[PDB]
């Protein structure tokens, strides 16, 4: 006992109630909370495998793919992205990146750590890519893989994906897409759109807690991952091992690492919620709830950051920071006086935007009113600073 | 035309069985910890989420006995903690010595090779352990930058003494990375005093915690090495400079890096609370007592224990030699089908040579030892003979 039992740890755990209207994680409805409080089962029991299997069907549904190599990564969005990158890229492979926000920048950082010859196409916070711009990119750097971000949480932008699959394949290159927008925004049809890898952190698209990530790989991608002459740099994210345990190959399942049993309860149950509601109904709900916010922000005299309404990520909306205010003051006001969490910017967008989130069953008209009164009080009572 | 209709399986209620988990972990969760798991979300970067991280950290300092400011939760499982440690400390080309006496050693090796280390295993059959003399011959021959040792071998049921190994490794200018699931039951662990430079565990293996989070600690010698390398480590997700910052271990303010598993952390904290109330000494007693009573009850069933020396027996995970004439799969399956009790066979080098029975935290009761003993007794009676 160099260290006595902590004093802080002898008090009951107490957490505040907060309405979470940032980019995610969001609040959890009762059913999903309940799943989180259930008892443990064996991390390699037949029921645990039955659950994984249902989850997998869920990921197939929410993504629209027949890919047998579909599975949950035992970590967050950064971990899914990495798993994808660490497997598909061999040290020395050319890697093209759609760097129009932080998630692009992250892709780049990871790709450099793992020895890829990274080639960013950089665009200021606000922008998106055209089939033409990507094609010039594909010609110039002859890459093995393209990263694109579908839903940009940094900038509030919704990248159209139609065409990009068939373009990348025509240049003998795969297409990795980071989507949080598959539930609200535009429909996603992986197989049809020709996307070769598609990933998301459960907590960003579903009403799920953080710690787990949905991922899917096309056969073209498997081919590339499974035929490389070097071993990928991680064992934790090694896809051969992971595919086996998740039941995506012929053989019996081997111990690899321990999956987060409890979260998987919740993940499954969240994939259930959407499975009942249906994709089409969920698209409507978000697109309707967003619009009403867009309208209510403008009535507060707030300028939306993404000028073209067609390029607006419904799940995460970006407001331009009003002239004469410190964005920190506003963000802090909304949390202190209304227990509402919003967010400023992130990476390139830092300090240029506010970020407001409408995620799943929190994408209500009521919550848009609650956050609209909060901002309206904040615009009223915060100081005018020299920016 | 949707390619894939809404799954039929997913329109039915989630239903799970009740199972007494007496394998190596995860174990069953007491009510308090279940409750924590069912609470509402808070901001993944709110001041309260930071207050919770900080308490957790104190917990890890207590359960490990360290003043190390570079202590934190890895946002992944034990393989992920080990990797984070290895990916940061080892630079491609560094000599790395490994105490390969079970699977976890073998995993260390696999990881070290993927990240370009010149790995040097000291291999020993399932059953064995290392002596200060054996390690020293190793330290001389391969002049390594780091040594991996497994404290509690869940593969073989062995309890590696750690005394001496810190001061030895430092005398040869090399760090000491230890994988311990035995800090709660078995032998006391005093990281700082034992000279251990890195120490990790998957919450679910030592605490009554759910999987998905891992406790880790680094000495200042280790920070020095991780923070002064000329190359970037191969992972961003486990990059320690970034992680140390977000977990509040350095001077600066906290930056978005990745999203920590809020809900699991509730549970992790609450489990570190449970032990904080019980106290380390009381927990050591409880496990060591509960193990002994099992050892005695298995022998009365005519079962041979796998680790011959009683001093080298990991209390938290016990290995029985598979009785002559029996398929181990039959027995394992009998226990689950007729008593809702989960035990395990072997793993890696130990595969098909052992059964593995677990006594973890508040499941380390005398009642559960009876329940599993009666299961095995019935299994010896109803399973095929040979």
Numbering used by the authors:
A (entry chain A): 6 to 392
B (entry chain B): 5 to 390
From the study:
Ser187 is a large-domain residue conserved in the mammalian AGTs and belongs to a random-coil region that is not part of the active site. In order to have a deeper understanding of the structural and functional effects of the S187F mutation on AGT, we have solved the X-ray crystal structure of the S187F variant to a resolution of 2.9 Å. The S187F structure superimposes well onto the normal AGT counterpart, with a root-mean-square deviation of 0.48 Å. Although the overall conformation of the two proteins is virtually identical, significant structural changes can be observed near the mutated amino acid as well as at the active site of the protein. As a result of the mutation, the loop that contains Phe187 substantially changes its conformation, and moves Phe187 into the position of Leu188 of normal AGT. Because of this displacement, the Val185 residue of the mutant protein also changes position, and its side chain moves away from the PLP. The small hydrophobic pocket that is formed by Phe187 and Leu188 can accommodate Ala210, which eventually causes a shift of Ala210 and Lys209 towards Phe187. In fact, the distance between the Cα of Lys209 and the C3 of the PLP methylpyridine ring decreases from 8.0 Å in the normal AGT enzyme to 6.5 Å in the mutant enzyme, and the distance between the Cα of Val185 and the C3 of the PLP methylpyridine ring increases from 4.9 Å in the normal AGT enzyme to 6.7 Å in the mutant. Moreover, as calculated by Pocket Finder, in S187F the PLP cavity has a volume of 1073 Å3, while in normal AGT it has a volume of 949 Å3.
